[PDB]
Design a binder for these strands. Structure first.
Lengths: 97, 93, 79, 57, 272, 144, 121, 323
RNA sequence: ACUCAACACGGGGAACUUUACCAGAUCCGGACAGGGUGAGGAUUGACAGAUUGAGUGUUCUUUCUCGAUCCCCUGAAUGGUGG
């Protein structure tokens, strides 16, 4: 939906231990592999001294799995009027229905 | 509404024009000695526009209007009637 | 005195504004010219002028289906 | 001819207490005067003499 | 409705602010517990709207995507009108993350008005949002990188090698794989990449010698300008042709030569 | 099953409705277009086509049902909204994408509401309403 | 002579008529002048296309015993009548292309020249 | 600017009695003519459309479209003597030409009908094609390129035989179909498609070409995917017939909802063999569910088209379509 | 206007006008041109028929007749017995 290029520059470079924020994704591995790779390259360039601890990237997961959203139960339906109708029923009434 | 030219020729050799404030037509010198006749509203429109362009100096008293026309006025006129002048007041004195 | 703000009963066809109805190259539609005979050009007209002092110059009349007309002195010679 | 003949007509006939209008302003309410054919009571006479009038009594 | 928390004086002051900034008669519409928000509303006043509608004053508010997109909002009953102008799976997935208020109610709902019973399917059904993300390799990036390396190279000694350590770690951390998707199937792989040292040479060689990379009157500038195509005259020989670090390394330790000054300065400062 | 029966139901309804308006239109127009041919010349009291038509089709926003966009919509959007209120599911946010859209919607609704305010200036109940308040005010003033 | 004498003298006498009202500018305006034979010194620009236009002019001008002169562009003719609106930047709003001037007045040195040219009857 | 006037006067005065300048001048019957124009959904009237106009980005369009349609009409009915010949228009003319039409029909008492009818129909479909509406998208893989998507293979072939826009590289002796293989390996590879290709063939309204070009490829991909699997052959293909022609493709289109990828045009016109029978489906499409249309294209990421707007149902005619 | 300093008071005895108020139609009295308009331009007025309370060109049909300021679009100006 960008402009997904500028992002990548800032995920390659320099002490950012990073937290990043997403909803659901259908792809885990291909992405994460690239990430964790160039994380290990950050460690590599800092070596030989290593860091206070060395890069690694974790990738929150374990067992909930999109029952995060669940409890607000979004209920999807349609309007769909009968063939007739009046727009003139007008203003404050008991019941509109 | 092409009594314009006549009105402008009444201006030059006077420097002054006067008219009542009325919606019903009457001659705006009451005599010019050239015996022109114009409405009232038509006159009023002419001087109104030229006023906004800075060429006129306006005076109102009672139910009437007294129109004087500047140094600036003389310029505009001479170009429109394509004629030089020695000057309006020197001819009159 | 006192006052309010609202005017709209409305919701009809309102009037269009009158706007000029153009004829293009009006002179050439009146004056007619010919094949050249004797090296002299013969000029005729489909428009004939009205006989009144006001119209006495060049000022032509008109042509409708059921009437003839003069827009200058607002007259009718009826057909 | 058309609209122009039907606009501003019935008091260029001149009738009633319309088409008066004071000399001093142009207001036609509060009586133009017909008394000795002066006009002043619509710019009020308290405001303006310079006609030679004064209250002596 | 009856339930409001907000005191009158609060409201009336905001309402006052509407009068002066009036535009679409946001004035009238807000006074009707009836509010709009999008980009065409000024930042100030649109914020003011949402302060009412988190306080419970207003009663629907009509917005465009941007609201639930980037901002927390209390909603229950959310409504959608047409698929116009462009509605996408991603956007349906956005709105569907919204509706219902935490611990107040356990419902919330959507209503599709309602031009199709077909297109609702083709949003709902098909799941997947994935990162198919874009490559960072670009000509302009590599000009920037050039002038970065050559920045402290201009007069300095110790500073050079210190900076050179830095630029090293930068340009090694960048162009590592990137090995995304579309790229693997472009005859690289499987699934490896790197490679890109050779690209950067081809680029570089073009870019110093051409005549009209300077400018009206022709190159030279500096006096050198060959040594670009010297590194092509090293690598492309055997292709070079297999390393991951050492040949990348070599590339960035070569690295001016003489590239064209006044023009590339004016590239980098149009983009900034 | 049922959901689409009503959908396609009201769609097909609309289309055949349209055709019917083209029948009324066709015969209206037929008279407007002045064919002079039918040489009866007022020796028959039924002319300009036969029978049978002579119906009146409901107009609401130019028709009732209505496909697509920006006509259907707004007419009902007030009522969509209002039923979430009358079900007592409280507040809600409506989405339409920019620019002209959201403004047409909002505007139209302000219109409708201002409309219904005017109808209640037909003034019976509202009349007594004013009649009261005024009385109370006067009384208070007199007391003070 | 020179064509300097031709066009510039024309432009001069032209100007003298514009500043007063001897001139007639237009189509049916010019035409109706020649029909009752009130015109004196007529002039024409031919660079037009609309056939005839031209034929009407020349026809009634000789038949009315009216002097006629011919010059080239209907461009330059326009700007010598000084029709054109040029604005704040001295650049176009409308710019006229105009044909068929009549004049009902006469010059002095430009008239003197026009005798010496002897252009038309 | 009376020249133009006398020319249009000429050809009128030849075609019929001299002068339609005289009566009819108004009309009486104006609703007849004006009904006939806009029941075919071409732009005649606006002073209120939905409501009063913006007064010109709109009315300008409406005008130019109108009077140019009227030109097309006039350039038909002037036949029944000799071949079609052009017409010139600015303002006032429009009315001139308008009168010419009136007197034709009014006199001849419905000798007109099939010509102005056929013309105005054809012309209408051409307008409704190009009124129409360009976009630049992007995106291709999002909306589009999941679910059931089709491209009918005539269009496929003409995409492969397309390149000028680079005259085609690789000197081979007219085995070219590498194109097809390539495209399969583009949008299966990094797209979803669930893809279907029809070969609709024959469409045409032929010949001039060796015409080995279709049947070879038809039978080719049929054999590929039908083999059962082979890890290159899943797209998959069906047969049919009877060309295009509708009252058939309904049973398919319904069950399976779908969006669509298709080609008119470049160049190579010709008239009836290409532009005709490709254009007329686009119109068809919009009367329906609505299925929307793409392409060629001018590609990787993406292409044209059109889209989400209102339609006129029914309005039809195909009658070339040789089988 | 409401105790004395409201209530044959507002020079207020109004048929139209006056006149604010109600139903309906008309006219620019929108200056100033920065932005658009070829010889036709942009433009003004109208007989007849129709619309209409109106033998009111308001508007349309029809054609004729005319300054190019009149005309078209934003800004601004203006007038008001509106507060």
């Amino acid at each position: 939906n960008g402009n997904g290029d500028v992002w990548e520059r800032i995920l390659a470079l320099l002490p950012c231990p990073f937290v990043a924020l997403s909803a659901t994704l259908g792809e885990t591995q291909q992405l994460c592999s690239w990430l964790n790779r160039v994380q290990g390259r950050l460690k590599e360039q800092t070596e030989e001294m290593s860091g206070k601890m060395r890069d690694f990237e974790v990738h929150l997961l374990p067992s909930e799995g999109k029952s995060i959203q669940r409890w607000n139960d979004i209920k999807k339906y349609i309007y769909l009027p009968p063939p007739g109708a009046a727009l003139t029923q007008k203003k404050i009434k008991a019941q509109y229905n | 509404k092409r009594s314009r030219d006549d009105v402008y020729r009444f201006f030059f050799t006077e420097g002054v024009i006067s008219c009542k404030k009325d919606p019903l037509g009457t001659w705006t010198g009451s005599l010019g000695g050239k015996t022109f006749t114009v409405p009232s509203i038509q006159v009023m429109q002419l001087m109104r526009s030229m006023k906004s362009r800075g060429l006129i100096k306006e005076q109102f008293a009672w139910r009437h209007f007294y129109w004087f026309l500047n140094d600036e006025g003389v310029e505009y006129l001479r170009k429109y009637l394509f004629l030089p002048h020695d000057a309006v007041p020197n001819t009159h004195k | 005195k006192g006052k309010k703000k609202k005017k709209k009963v409305f919701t009809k066809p309102k009037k269009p504004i009158h706007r000029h109805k153009l004829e293009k190259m009006r002179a050439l539609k009146y004056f007619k010219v010919t094949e050249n005979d004797d090296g002299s050009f013969k000029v005729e007209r489909t428009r004939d002028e009205c006989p009144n002092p006001v119209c006495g110059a060049g000022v032509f009349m008109a042509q409708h289906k059921d009437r003839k007309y003069c827009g200058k002195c607002h007259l009718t010679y009826a057909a | 001819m058309g609209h122009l003949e039907q606009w501003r007509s019935r008091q260029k006939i001149g009738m009633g207490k319309g088409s008066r209008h004071c000399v001093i302003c142009s207001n036609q309410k509060a009586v133009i005067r017909k008394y000795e054919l002066n006009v002043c009571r619509q710019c009020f006479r308290e405001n303006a003499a310079n006609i030679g009038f004064s209250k002596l009594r | 409705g009856e339930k409001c928390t907000v005191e009158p004086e609060v409201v009336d002051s905001l309402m006052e602010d509407c009068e002066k900034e009036g535009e679409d008669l946001l004035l009238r519409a807000l006074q009707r517990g009836i509010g709009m928000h999008h980009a065409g509303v000024k930042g100030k006043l649109r914020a003011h709207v949402e302060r009412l509608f988190r306080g419970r004053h207003c009663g629907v508010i009509f917005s465009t995507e941007t609201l639930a997109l980037g901002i927390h909002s209390p909603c229950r009953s959310v409504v959608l009108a047409g698929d116009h102008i462009l509605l996408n799976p991603t956007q349906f997935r956005q709105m569907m993350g919204r509706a219902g208020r935490r611990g107040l109610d356990y419902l919330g709902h959507l209503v599709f008005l309602g031009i199709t019973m077909r297109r609702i399917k083709r949003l709902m059904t098909s799941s997947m949002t994935v990162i198919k993300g874009n490559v960072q390799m670009d000509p302009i990036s590599n000009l920037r990188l050039l002038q970065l390396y050559d920045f402290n190279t201009l007069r300095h000694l110790k500073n050079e090698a210190g900076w050179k350590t830095h630029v090293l770690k930068l340009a090694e951390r960048l162009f590592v794989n990137p090995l995304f998707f579309q790229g693997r199937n472009s005859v690289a792989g499987g699934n490896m990449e790197g490679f890109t040292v050779e690209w950067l040479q081809m680029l570089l060689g073009y870019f110093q010698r051409e005549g009209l990379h300077f400018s009206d009157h022709a190159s030279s500038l500096g006096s050198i300008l060959q040594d670009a195509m010297y590194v092509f005259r090293e690598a492309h020989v055997g292709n070079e042709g297999f390393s991951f670090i050492r040949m990348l390394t070599s590339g960035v330790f070569d690295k001016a030569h003489y590239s064209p000054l006044y023009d590339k300065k004016l590239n980098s400062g149009v983009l900034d | 099953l049922l959901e689409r029966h009503a959908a396609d139901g009201m769609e097909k309804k609309k289309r055949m409705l349209l055709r019917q308006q083209h029948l009324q239109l066709l015969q209206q127009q037929e008279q407007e277009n002045e064919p002079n041919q039918e040489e009866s010349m007022e020796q028959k009291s039924e002319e300009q086509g036969g029978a049978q038509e002579e119906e009146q089709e409901k107009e609401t926003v130019g028709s009732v049902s209505f496909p697509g966009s920006r006509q259907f919509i707004r007419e009902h959007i007030l009522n969509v909204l209002r039923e979430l209120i009358a079900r007592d599911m409280g507040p809600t946010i409506v989405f339409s994408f920019e620019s002209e859209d959201c403004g047409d919607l909002v505007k139209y609704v302000v219109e409708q509401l201002e409309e219904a305010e005017s109808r209640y200036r037909k003034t019976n109940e509202f009349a007594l309403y004013k009649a009261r308040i005024e009385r109370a005010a006067a009384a208070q003033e007199a007391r003070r | 002579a020179t064509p300097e004498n031709l066009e510039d003298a024309l432009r001069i006498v032209l100007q003298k008529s514009r500043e007063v009202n001897g001139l007639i500018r237009g189509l049916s305006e010019v035409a109706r002048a020649l029909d009752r034979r009130t015109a004196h010194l007529c002039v024409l620009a031919e660079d037009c296309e609309d056939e005839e236009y031209k034929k009407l002019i020349t026809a009634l001008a000789k038949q009315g015993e009216v002097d006629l002169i011919n010059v080239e562009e209907r461009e330059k003719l326009a700007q010598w009548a000084g029709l054109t609106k040029m604005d704040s930047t001295g650049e176009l709003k409308k710019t006229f292309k105009c044909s068929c001037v009549a004049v009902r007045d006469f010059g002095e040195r430009t008239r003197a020249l026009e005798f010496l040219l002897s252009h038309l009857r | 600017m009376s020249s133009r006037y006398r020319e249009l006067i000429a050809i009128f005065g030849e075609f019929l009695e001299e002068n339609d300048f005289h009566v009819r001048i108004s009309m009486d019957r104006v609703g007849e003519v004006k009904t006939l124009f806009s029941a075919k959904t071409i732009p005649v009237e606006s002073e209120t459309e939905a409501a009063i106009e913006v007064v010109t980005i709109e009315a300008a369009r409406r005008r130019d479209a109108l009077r140019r349609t009227c030109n097309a009409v006039l350039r038909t009915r002037h036949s029944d003597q000799h071949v079609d010949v052009g017409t010139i228009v600015a303002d006032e003319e429009e009315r001139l030409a308008w009168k010419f039409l009136i007197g034709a029909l009014a006199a001849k008492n419905s000798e007109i009908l099939p010509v102005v009818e056929a013309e105005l129909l054809l012309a209408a479909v051409e307008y409704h094609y190009a009124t129409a509406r360009p976009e630049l998208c992007d995106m291709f893989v999002h909306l589009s390129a999941s679910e059931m998507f089709f491209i009918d293979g005539d269009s496929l072939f003409m995409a492969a035989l397309s390149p000028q826009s680079v005259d085609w590289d690789l000197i081979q002796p007219l085995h070219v179909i590498y194109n097809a293989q390539k495209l399969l390996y583009d949008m299966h590879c990094r797209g979803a498609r669930f893809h279907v290709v029809f070969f609709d063939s024959l469409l045409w309204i032929w010949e001039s070409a060796p015409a080995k070009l279709f049947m070879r490829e038809n039978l080719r991909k049929t054999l590929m995917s039908l083999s059962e699997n082979d890890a290159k052959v899943g797209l998959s293909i069906s047969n049919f017939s009877s060309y295009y022609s509708e009252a058939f493709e309904t049973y398919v289109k319904q069950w399976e909802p779908e969006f669509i990828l298709m080609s008119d045009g470049e160049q190579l016109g010709r008239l009836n063999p290409l532009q005709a029978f490709f254009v007329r489906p686009s119109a068809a499409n919009n009367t329906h569910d609505s299925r929307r249309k793409a392409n060629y294209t001018d590609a990787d990421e993406a292409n044209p088209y059109r889209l989400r707007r209102q339609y006129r149902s029914i309005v039809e005619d195909e009658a070339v379509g040789d089988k």
